């Protein structure tokens, strides 16, 4: 957990050759102590101090661990820890070197690089995920009374069913 957060993204290419260095399972499974005993107590005590504080911490963790799942849902990336997008690296002005980024730069310094335009990227991504990609997919299966009738696409289908 967090075991190479100080490494460069090339030595934190090591982090995402493992489970993003165990970050997500540490997000949801560090609940296990307050999951193991909010209920092992059999005591009256007539009032509760943790009955609001622990509950607020718990539902705070849950809504934070659902906003990110919904944001991966909105960019077609739901399930996939590492996925690619149709949004290009745009006019976004931190254009620099590949062998500088993924060899000698930590994740935190990288966050300091692109601390601006991050909401620009987040607004930008769903645009190419939806506004044309979903509409192109809607163009796919509407008009083809000739979808049963396909003669020169069998080769891709055969390749595709094996690989």
């Amino acid at each position: 957990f967090l075991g190479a957060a100080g490494s460069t993204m090339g030595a934190a290419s090591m982090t995402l050759t493992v489970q993003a260095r165990n970050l997500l399972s540490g997000i949801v499974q560090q609940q296990s102590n307050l999951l193991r005993a909010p209920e092992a107590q059999q005591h009256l005590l007539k009032l509760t101090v943790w009955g609001i504080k622990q509950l607020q911490a718990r539902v705070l963790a849950v809504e934070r661990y659902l906003r990110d799942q919904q944001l991966l849902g909105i960019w077609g990336c739901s399930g996939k820890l590492i996925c690619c997008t149709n949004v290009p690296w745009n006019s976004s002005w931190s254009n620099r070197n590949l062998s500088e980024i993924w060899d000698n730069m930590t994740w935190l310094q990288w966050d300091k690089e692109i601390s601006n335009y991050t909401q620009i990227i987040y607004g930008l991504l769903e645009e190419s995920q939806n506004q044309q990609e979903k509409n192109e997919q809607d163009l796919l299966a509407l008009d083809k009374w000739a979808s049963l009738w396909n003669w020169f696409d069998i080769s891709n289908w055969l390749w595709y069913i094996k690989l």
Partner: antibody
Amino acid sequence: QVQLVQSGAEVKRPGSSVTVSCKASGGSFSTYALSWVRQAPGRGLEWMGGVIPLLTITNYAPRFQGRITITADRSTSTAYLELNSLRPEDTAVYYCAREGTTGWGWLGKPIGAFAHWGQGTLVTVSS
Amino acid sequence: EIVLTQSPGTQSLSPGERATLSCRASQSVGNNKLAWYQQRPGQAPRLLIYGASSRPSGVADRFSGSGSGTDFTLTISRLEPEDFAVYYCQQYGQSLSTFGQGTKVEVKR
């Protein structure tokens, strides 16, 4: 790369039938749509029809259907075309062409386009 | 049957001219499936742009296809002395197909 060494040009009596070969080399004889095209010696180009050797799917011509025969014999790894009724208006060059694939190889996802080709021989009848 | 009808005549352009062709058809090809076929007399008719948008590794970048639906478009920025030949496009959409009509590009004196 993918090499389609077509058999040579031929002379033959008119009114008879004709056979031509296209021996592939490299990539895969099967699992990719080998096909066949025409061009009259001076005209543009013209597609006729093909074959898929793993499932013998024959997708034939809009007009030459019934007179064309394409096979696929993977046990000696060739591909033959049999046309009939030789005539001065069957005179065209007959290129044998294979569908290509993505990446530099012969195994990945196909493209749908006649990428790799063969040398072609003019199939002209003799009087 | 989709009668593919490209329609510039002789593309009598100078060496170094934008080789833009008409490249249409009778009706719309399904799923924009079009391939782009350069051809020389006696040689192999060679693919340029598969799917009318993407180009394989090895084909020169000066070949460039565009358009969709019924009529596509090919532009070629630089005209080299070896590309002066006849150009066609061909559908891989509907189960029947036909090639381009024939547009010759040449050296212009």
